Amino acid sequence: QSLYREIHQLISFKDVLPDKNLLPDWSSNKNPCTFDGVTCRDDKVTSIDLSSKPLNVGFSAVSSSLLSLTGLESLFLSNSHINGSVSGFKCSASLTSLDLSRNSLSGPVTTLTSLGSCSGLKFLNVSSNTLDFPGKVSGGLKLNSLEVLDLSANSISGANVVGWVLSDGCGELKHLAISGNKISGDVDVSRCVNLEFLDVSSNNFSTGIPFLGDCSALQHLDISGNKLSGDFSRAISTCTELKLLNISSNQFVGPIPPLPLKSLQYLSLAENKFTGEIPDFLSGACDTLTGLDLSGNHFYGAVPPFFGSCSLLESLALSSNNFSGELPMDTLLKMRGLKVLDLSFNEFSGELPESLTNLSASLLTLDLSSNNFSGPILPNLCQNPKNTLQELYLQNNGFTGKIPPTLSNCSELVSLHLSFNYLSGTIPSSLGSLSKLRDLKLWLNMLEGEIPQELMYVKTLETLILDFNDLTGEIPSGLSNCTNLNWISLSNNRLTGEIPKWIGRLENLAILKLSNNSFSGNIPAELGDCRSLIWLDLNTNLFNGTIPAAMFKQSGKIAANFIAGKRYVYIKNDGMKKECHGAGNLLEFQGIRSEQLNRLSTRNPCNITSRVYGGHTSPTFDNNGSMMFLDMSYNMLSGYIPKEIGSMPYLFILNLGHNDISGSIPDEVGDLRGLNILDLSSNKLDGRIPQAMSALTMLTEIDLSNNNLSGPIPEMGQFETFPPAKFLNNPGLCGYPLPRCDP
Ligand SMILES: *[C@@H]1O[C@H](CO)[C@@H](O[C@@H]2O[C@H](CO)[C@@H](O[C@@H]3O[C@H](CO[C@H]4O[C@H](CO[C@H]5O[C@H](CO)[C@@H](O)[C@H](O)[C@@H]5O)[C@@H](O)[C@H](O[C@H]5O[C@H](CO)[C@@H](O)[C@H](O)[C@@H]5O)[C@@H]4O)[C@@H](O)[C@H](O[C@H]4O[C@H](CO)[C@@H](O)[C@H](O)[C@@H]4O)[C@@H]3O)[C@H](O)[C@H]2NC(C)=O)[C@H](O)[C@H]1NC(C)=O
Ligand SMILES: *[C@@H]1O[C@H](CO)[C@@H](O[C@@H]2O[C@H](CO)[C@@H](O[C@@H]3O[C@H](CO)[C@@H](O)[C@H](O[C@H]4O[C@H](CO[C@H]5O[C@H](CO)[C@@H](O)[C@H](O)[C@@H]5O)[C@@H](O)[C@H](O)[C@@H]4O)[C@@H]3O)[C@H](O)[C@H]2NC(C)=O)[C@H](O)[C@H]1NC(C)=O
Ligand SMILES: *[C@@H]1O[C@H](CO)[C@@H](O[C@@H]2O[C@H](CO)[C@@H](O[C@@H]3O[C@H](CO)[C@@H](O)[C@H](O[C@H]4O[C@H](CO)[C@@H](O)[C@H](O)[C@@H]4O)[C@@H]3O)[C@H](O)[C@H]2NC(C)=O)[C@H](O)[C@H]1NC(C)=O
Ligand SMILES: *[C@@H]1O[C@H](CO[C@@H]2O[C@@H](C)[C@@H](O)[C@@H](O)[C@@H]2O)[C@@H](O[C@@H]2O[C@H](CO)[C@@H](O)[C@H](O)[C@H]2NC(C)=O)[C@H](O)[C@H]1NC(C)=O
Ligand SMILES: CC[C@@H](C(C)C)[C@@H](O)[C@H](O)[C@@H](C)[C@H]1CC[C@H]2[C@@H]3COC(=O)[C@@H]4C[C@H](O)[C@H](O)C[C@]4(C)[C@H]3CC[C@]12C
Ligand SMILES: *[C@@H]1O[C@H](CO)[C@@H](O[C@@H]2O[C@H](CO)[C@@H](O)[C@H](O)[C@H]2NC(C)=O)[C@H](O)[C@H]1NC(C)=O
Ligand SMILES: *[C@@H]1O[C@H](CO)[C@@H](O[C@@H]2O[C@H](CO)[C@@H](O)[C@H](O)[C@H]2NC(C)=O)[C@H](O)[C@H]1NC(C)=O
Ligand SMILES: *[C@@H]1O[C@H](CO)[C@@H](O[C@@H]2O[C@H](CO)[C@@H](O)[C@H](O)[C@H]2NC(C)=O)[C@H](O)[C@H]1NC(C)=O
Ligand SMILES: *[C@@H]1O[C@H](CO)[C@@H](O)[C@H](O)[C@H]1NC(C)=O
Ligand SMILES: *[C@@H]1O[C@H](CO)[C@@H](O)[C@H](O)[C@H]1NC(C)=O
Numbered sequence: 001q002s003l004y005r006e007i008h009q010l011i012s013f014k015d016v017l018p019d020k021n022l023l024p025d026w027s028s029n030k031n032p033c034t035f036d037g038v039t040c041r042d043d044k045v046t047s048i049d050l051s052s053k054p055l056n057v058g059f060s061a062v063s064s065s066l067l068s069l070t071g072l073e074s075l076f077l078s079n080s081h082i083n084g085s086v087s088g089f090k091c092s093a094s095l096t097s098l099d100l101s102r103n104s105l106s107g108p109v110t111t112l113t114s115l116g117s118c119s120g121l122k123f124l125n126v127s128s129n130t131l132d133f134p135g136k137v138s139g140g141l142k143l144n145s146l147e148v149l150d151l152s153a154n155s156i157s158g159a160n161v162v163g164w165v166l167s168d169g170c171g172e173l174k175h176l177a178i179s180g181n182k183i184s185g186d187v188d189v190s191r192c193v194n195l196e197f198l199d200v201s202s203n204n205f206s207t208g209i210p211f212l213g214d215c216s217a218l219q220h221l222d223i224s225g226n227k228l229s230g231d232f233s234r235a236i237s238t239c240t241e242l243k244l245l246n247i248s249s250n251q252f253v254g255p256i257p258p259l260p261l262k263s264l265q266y267l268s269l270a271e272n273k274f275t276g277e278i279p280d281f282l283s284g285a286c287d288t289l290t291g292l293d294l295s296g297n298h299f300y301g302a303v304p305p306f307f308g309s310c311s312l313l314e315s316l317a318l319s320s321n322n323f324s325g326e327l328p329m330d331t332l333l334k335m336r337g338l339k340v341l342d343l344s345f346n347e348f349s350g351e352l353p354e355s356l357t358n359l360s361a362s363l364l365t366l367d368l369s370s371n372n373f374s375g376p377i378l379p380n381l382c383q384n385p386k387n388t389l390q391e392l393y394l395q396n397n398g399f400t401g402k403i404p405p406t407l408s409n410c411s412e413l414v415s416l417h418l419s420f421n422y423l424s425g426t427i428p429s430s431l432g433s434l435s436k437l438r439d440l441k442l443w444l445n446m447l448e449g450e451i452p453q454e455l456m457y458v459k460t461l462e463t464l465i466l467d468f469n470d471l472t473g474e475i476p477s478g479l480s481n482c483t484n485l486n487w488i489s490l491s492n493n494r495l496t497g498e499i500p501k502w503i504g505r506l507e508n509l510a511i512l513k514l515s516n517n518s519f520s521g522n523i524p525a526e527l528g529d530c531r532s533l534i535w536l537d538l539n540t541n542l543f544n545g546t547i548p549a550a551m552f553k554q555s556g557k558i559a560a561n562f563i564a565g566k567r568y569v570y571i572k573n574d575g576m577k578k579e580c581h582g583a584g585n586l587l588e589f590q591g592i593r594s595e596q597l598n599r600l601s602t603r604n605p606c607n608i609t610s611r612v613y614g615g616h617t618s619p620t621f622d623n624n625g626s627m628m629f630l631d632m633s634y635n636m637l638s639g640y641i642p643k644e645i646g647s648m649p650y651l652f653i654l655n656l657g658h659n660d661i662s663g664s665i666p667d668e669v670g671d672l673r674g675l676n677i678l679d680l681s682s683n684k685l686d687g688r689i690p691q692a693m694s695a696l697t698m699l700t701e702i703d704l705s706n707n708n709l710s711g712p713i714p715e716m717g718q719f720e721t722f723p724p725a726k727f728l729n730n731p732g733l734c735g736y737p738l739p740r741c742d743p
């Protein structure tokens, strides 16, 4: 109250910070109403917001200094590096909202009961902390005066945790979120008659569907990301106010049951096992439906035409089912509000009706990937002015013809995916006018010609995927201006020339795959200036000279974060004929079926069956890392391997096989702790196998055959694991698994 007490409480909080300089304008002889982070009314402090400031202090400092302020109405400390746990404290009765999200609060969730000191508390957000529920679930939260409680993203593992929260009553509760825990058991919110928002998603619920009682107030129901399979239809039948219903990522089955459609705006049944065709009774929702997600089920049939009246539908996700027929334009154009259209991974056939060019001017995302669409790409597409299309996903179809340069009109285009098709012609230089294009993916086509240098104008280019084409020429110098590139893969073309030394300017460059081309010259030492390079595949080319030791200078300082989250497939080498080269083909694979990897048989000499790994890219570190994959096999590299080769603790494959490398294996190779595969076969390596290699503990595969090696095999680590074949054609070589070292 009194200004003297206000200032001293606040400054005592500042004086406890490890870095007092985080609150620079907080001074012991100014009015706190002038402080950054402070809100005042009539010269009295009412709210404090130090969110996203690394205060690095325990909750004891908060409760004793800030939460004791008389008249403080709200305290926001989201992502402030608060740790410790909530304990008893004297709480101003004016405090109504407390945001302690995204901190390091620990202890059992029963600690939050001590927040009952706050007689006026109505909003509590302790999400993204480490509260848990050890031992028995008993007692109660005893915060029944709350209107909004968010316990999401904690470490709460237990059954009937929800009952524990609401045990003491929930008449006042309007918004409950406990998502992202490991909670199970029953959800009984029938006594919470003013509950409008319920999010129990991403938990461990596998038994009863939540019981909603009269469901008088519920507008938002999210039970997705569990293992539910019960009769949710009966559970929500009385939910006349339900605006959002998310039951996706569960174990539900059967046809689409009855649903409350009066107020329904968002409906997701995605990632379940629902069957049948889209029922007609869903037309009742078209007065209000703004988003529909039926993706990832066993639906079939055409798109019912009642969807024509769904004029408010902004997103229509039907992907990964078995819908067939031609592109139902008769219905799509009536969807005046449609902004996202996802029919991917279906069996929609036919050519692209001309009327499709109209949707370009309203859609933001047109996803038709993985279907039976034939014919060419509409040249008249995007010819409608002020087009708004941002994502065009047509990959894995049967499109023929050329890439229409008119796609340059789609000025708002950020991602372009024409891969896995039969497109001929060249890459039009007009694509360089896409000032916002980030993803350009055109791999597995029949594109001839050179790469357009007009891409130097695309300063936002992030990925550049052009594998399996007939491209000739060199790497255009203009791409140096594409400094945001994090993925460039040009393999299986007929490219020539060298790797430009400006490759080291691309600090975001993480993956660089150039295999099965005719690149020449030495390895640029500037590849060591790449702060993000983690995947380097140069196999089957004409590189010569020696390996520069400088390319491994960024080891221990590599960052790999922008590259994470990208769908890929890794096709392990068949290990059969000498035709298949390299460890494996890392291939971009967004919106493509692995079943259609048979198309690679006409372009890749490898056996694909039982050798295709997939998923989303996930580097083994966030910072202070190194290179992960290094394959320069099938070239003409000479000289000796530099000792710096062993400075990559995250390298799990190293293939230098089929070259002209001389000298001995550096003992530093034994520092490659993470090495899974080590191929050095078909070279001129001489000397003994360094004993330090017996320290490699994760080698699932080695091959030192066809060299000039001699002496005993380390035979102290994993070398006995391997069959003789991996050591044959080394005359002087001996020791198990080879014949014993004799005179
Ligand atoms: C109906 O219910 C369903 C199911 O419950 C629900 O679907 C979930 O929706 C949420 C929110 O949309 C999803 O969670 C988010 O997923 C994001 C994607 O994570 C991937 O990509 C990350 C990189 O993102 C960047 O790059 C990618 C690729 O270049 C690009 O697409 C992105 O736009 C972006 O630029 C990547 O880091 C991540 O990998 C890490 O995380 C995953 C776990 O998610 C882990 O498995 C990996 O090992 C790795 O650690 C992954 O590949 C992601 O952006 C996002 O995270 C941000 O937001 C959260 C808060 O939402 C913050 O906590 C976080 O700090 C980030 O800011 C978040 O995780 C979720 O995956 C969906 N679940 C399913 C099953 O689909 C619907 O939304 C509901 N619908 C409604 C309510 O209408
Ligand atoms: C660098 O790129 C060029 C292309 O630019 C690659 O050369 C291509 O290689 C293709 C695959 O070898 C080849 O197509 C094949 O052609 C023959 C007839 O000529 C067909 O029989 C093949 O399809 C049929 O047979 C294969 C047989 O099995 C495959 O896998 C096993 C694995 O050991 C091998 O024995 C065999 O070599 C096959 O690869 C079946 O898988 C098929 O389903 C089908 O029944 C192929 O279509 C192209 O003609 C050829 N291109 C050129 C320009 O000559 C080149 O190999 C590549 N090099 C690399 C990556 O190192
Ligand atoms: C309790 O605190 C947590 C932690 O702050 C809080 O969760 C956070 O909520 C915000 C807001 O919803 C999330 O950020 C959103 O993320 C999604 C996906 O990227 C977007 O839809 C949102 O965009 C909105 O904001 C943009 C910027 O203004 C707008 O351009 C856009 O139109 C949208 O309005 C938004 O960025 C954030 O990710 C979470 N954080 C975590 C860690 O989950 C939670 O809401 C709080 N609980 C309560 C009950 O208030
Ligand atoms: C790496 O190769 C380049 C390109 O030339 C190839 O390799 C040569 C050794 C020879 O076999 C050529 O027919 C190949 O096309 C080399 O540049 C060549 O340098 C050599 C040696 O002085 C010379 O005879 C050629 O004329 C050069 N070619 C050109 C186009 O200027 C380069 O020197 C090779 N690097 C090493 C370390 O040998
Ligand atoms: C590719 C995308 C990555 C990004 C980060 C670039 C990342 O997302 C991946 O997870 C990557 C690091 C995976 C996919 C394929 C896996 C292969 C499988 O094939 C084998 O069998 C190999 C031989 C042997 O079995 C060995 O033990 C396992 C081997 C080497 C693994 C290694 C790890 C993977 C490479
Ligand atoms: C998710 O729920 C399942 C099922 O309730 C849990 O598995 C049970 O674990 C207990 C404790 O060990 C066992 O007594 C049961 O036999 C298990 N049941 C089954 C069907 O396996 C599982 O542990 C939960 N997971 C988490 C992360 O909480
Ligand atoms: C998915 O749909 C396809 C396409 O309809 C089904 O395969 C057959 O398709 C032909 C038309 O080309 C129909 O005459 C047949 O009746 C379809 N078969 C059956 C059994 O319905 C395919 O079976 C469907 N299922 C899956 C899992 O893809
Ligand atoms: C690719 O590998 C698969 C196995 O992953 C091979 O499958 C063989 O199939 C033939 C008949 O076509 C059988 O005689 C073999 O016994 C199978 N081998 C297995 C299952 O290991 C397939 O032949 C390989 N393809 C090529 C071209 O070599
Ligand atoms: C909170 O973080 C500080 C700063 O690292 C640390 O010294 C302290 O031990 C932490 N407190 C608890 C209770 O873990
Ligand atoms: C459509 O392509 C799928 C594979 O993506 C195939 O199973 C199906 O038979 C094809 N349909 C027609 C009519 O060609």
Ligand SMILES: *[C@@H]1O[C@H](CO)[C@@H](O)[C@H](O)[C@H]1NC(C)=O
Pocket (backbone or CB within 6 Å): 456, 457, 478, 480, 481
């Ligand atoms: C390309 O980068 C060079 C300098 O490396 C610069 O002179 C040139 O103007 C850049 N191009 C564009 C279009 O900005």
Ligand code: NA
Pocket (backbone or CB within 6 Å): 426, 427, 428, 447, 448, 449, 450, 451, 452
């Ligand atoms: Na081109």
